[PDB]
Amino acid sequence: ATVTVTKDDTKAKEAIKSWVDAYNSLVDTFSSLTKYTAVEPGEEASDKNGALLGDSVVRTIQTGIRAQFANSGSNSAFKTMAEIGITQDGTSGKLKIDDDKLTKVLKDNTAAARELLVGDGKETGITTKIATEVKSYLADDGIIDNAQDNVNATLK
Amino acid sequence: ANRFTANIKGLTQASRNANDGISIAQTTEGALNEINNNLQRVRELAVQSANSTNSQSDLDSIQAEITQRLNEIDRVSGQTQFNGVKVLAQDNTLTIQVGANDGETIDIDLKQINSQTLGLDTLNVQQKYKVSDTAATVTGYADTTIAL
Amino acid sequence: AAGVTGTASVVKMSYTDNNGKTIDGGLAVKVGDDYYSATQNKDGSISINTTKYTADDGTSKTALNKLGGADGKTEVVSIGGKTYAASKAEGHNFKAQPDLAEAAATTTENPLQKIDAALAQVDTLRSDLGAVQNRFNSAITNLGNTVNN
């Protein structure tokens, strides 16, 4: 009676799509919160504009997340998301995946992707750095909370 | 009362001038955000090129999208305008009156942001091919329209 | 008739890469220091391809397509003592639109450095616009209150 053991990429790909979708939703939220709209000369901005139009916190967060993509020091052979079949659009800023290329690399060099995405978990790992920054933002002192405390000023 | 009325009307007109100024600034931001996104895609593709094992054909293919994005930057830069003002046209300064007397303005600075000014027009990542030159297997014959 | 001549012969360049991978080239007229792409015509004439353009002296001109570029095989033209891409040079206003820069000669150094500098400029500018936006919002608030009073 025979037994077989192979490799499981399903769970991984599976997992990755959720992260990409979450990031895309976040970008959508940015766009909605700072929706621009031109107006006639001589008249102040239109009401329909996003409530955060002209704010710098949104830019701060959006920029801060991105640079975490370019992880530093990771021993993983790959150094970029394209190498693992994930690309970012230069006009919309959203993330897309070449699913079959992802599958191929999964079967080929899963270890390099392991190192690149997380690795040791101390400093290596785009997710590691991103988690650091996201926690920093969400903190009580985090930019959003200190801006929501200058907006607890806008309130109190 | 005359002084008060003069100040009132002047301040109203200043308010509308401020309307225009804020609008132009917001449009400038709107353009700059997309410009920045494009540049970030460009950096992604460059670090993708950083894969030393890739072929020169792959390098050329990547350079294709690099050129596409550069042309897109030029398009957007030449496109964006406000009330007949090409916002990114050239290194320029605008003074907007917001007071009620002479020389009472807010100053704004604008730049000729484009592929050329940023200096990324000439950027490239390709590697020169090895080319062997020979008469090659030119089968058949040439039957040119000779001037007999 | 172009006024420059040499080892004019019909060739089809073949290619190789760092990986030694099998890759082929194309038909061209070998001269020597210069190689010009050639097209095979219905009458068998291996005719050297040419690029159309507006001359920098005010006239309309055309010149042979010379191989080159950062790859060494792109079709390029020389106008005003400098080499420019055949794709770009087509009918361009070389006279009063100097925006067309020379075709890339080789691999570019520290492109990441250049990109980072550009992005720094863009970010600084955006921050400036945000600051002036806030200034103008303050100004409008001041004007409204003052008008009321």
Author numbering:
A (entry chain S): 261 to 416
B (entry chain C): 51 to 198
C (entry chain C): 298 to 446
From the study:
The flagellum is the most prominent extracellular structure in bacteria, with a molecular weight in the hundreds of megadaltons. Structurally, the flagellum can be divided into three major components: basal body, hook and filament. A ring-like structure formed by the proteins FlgK and FlgL, termed the hook–filament junction (HFJ), forms the connection between the flexible hook and the rigid filament. To assemble a filament, flagellin monomers are secreted through the flagellar basal body and hook, and polymerize at the distal end.
Here we report the structure of the filament cap complex in its native environment, assembled at the distal end of the flagellar filament. Three-dimensional (3D) classification identified the different states of the cap, resulting in a final 3.7-Å map resolving all five FliD subunits. The final cap model contains 5 FliD subunits and 17 copies of FliC in the filament; the HFJ model contains 13 copies of FlgE, 11 copies of FlgK and FlgL, and 14 copies of FliC. The flagellar cap complex is composed of five FliD subunits assembled into a pentamer with an overall shape resembling an acorn. The D2–D3 domains assemble into a star-shaped plane and the D0–D1 helices form a plug-like structure beneath. The D2–D3 plane and D0–D1 helices surround a large cavity, much larger than that described previously, and the D0 domains form an almost closed constriction in the secretion channel. All five FliD subunits show a pseudosymmetric arrangement, forming an asymmetric unit with three adjacent FliC molecules, labelled FliC 0, FliC +5 and FliC +6. Moreover, FliD 4 forms a substantially smaller interface with FliC +5. These unique features indicate that FliD 4 participates in the incorporation of a new FliC, which occurs in the gap between FliD 4 and FliC +6. During the incorporation of a FliC molecule, the D0–D1 domains of FliD 4 rise upwards (Δ = 25 Å) and shift in the clockwise (CW) direction (θ = 18°).
